[PDB]
Copies of this chain bind each other. A is one copy, B any other.
Amino acid sequence: AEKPKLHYFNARGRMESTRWLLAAAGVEFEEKFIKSAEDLDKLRNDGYLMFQQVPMVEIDGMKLVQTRAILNYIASKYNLYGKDIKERALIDMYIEGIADLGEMILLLPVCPPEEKDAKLALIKEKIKNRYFPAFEKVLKSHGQDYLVGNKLSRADIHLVELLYYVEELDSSLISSFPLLKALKTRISNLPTVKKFLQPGSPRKPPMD
């Protein structure tokens, strides 16, 4: 059960959703920071990156690249991917909706400054009219504690992670969604997650 090793920069970027899932499942890990174009060159030049890029994760004797491959393997290994291929399809539809919204928030600060005001405007519109309504409807339809199978899964974790970034954006956006508000609370109080949210954890700060 040796430790998985995360290779990335000292930032949120494309490694942060992997930090959140390993911690919620209670696994302990080490990180390898990248601080220069020289270290990035020795990984590459040493044959560690199949497509010459990070993120990279060493686990169970492998060297994986691509965020979605890293996340799907961990979720299976720790039983966080539902019980059968029909549960996985519901889970897959929900989390890809969440990654579509996350990616726009993620690239927002690299947009052209002359294009910045309209892109932001467009992202709260979708949050309000498309994505937040869709997930409140899911929880209302069955009235249960979790999004799928009445049991904790990766979908609850990736959703709650996104709710925090939205709050940093505009804390009024979640108001009219009381079922979402309460999920955020119940998940943030699980022992493994409450720790990861406490000061001193491997959680990383905004991309100042």
Given contacts A51-B131, A130-B52, is CB(A96)–CB(B69) below 8 Å? yes
Task: Determine if A107 is an interface residue (Cβ-Cβ < 8 Å).
Answer: no
Query: Which one, A72-80, A111-119, A142-150, A158-166, is touching chain B?
Result: A72-80
Task: Determine if A27 is an interface residue (Cβ-Cβ < 8 Å).
Answer: no
| With A51-B130, A69-B92, A73-B88 already in contact, 16 other A-B pairs whose C-beta atoms are closer than 8 Å | A51-B100, A51-B131, A60-B86, A64-B89, A66-B92, A66-B96, A68-B92, A68-B96, A69-B89, A69-B93, A69-B96, A72-B88, A72-B92, A73-B86, A76-B85, A77-B85
Chain A residues engaging chain B, CB cutoff 8 angstroms: 50-52, 60, 62, 64-66, 68-69, 72-73, 76-77, 85-86, 88-89, 92-93, 96-97, 100, 130-131, 134
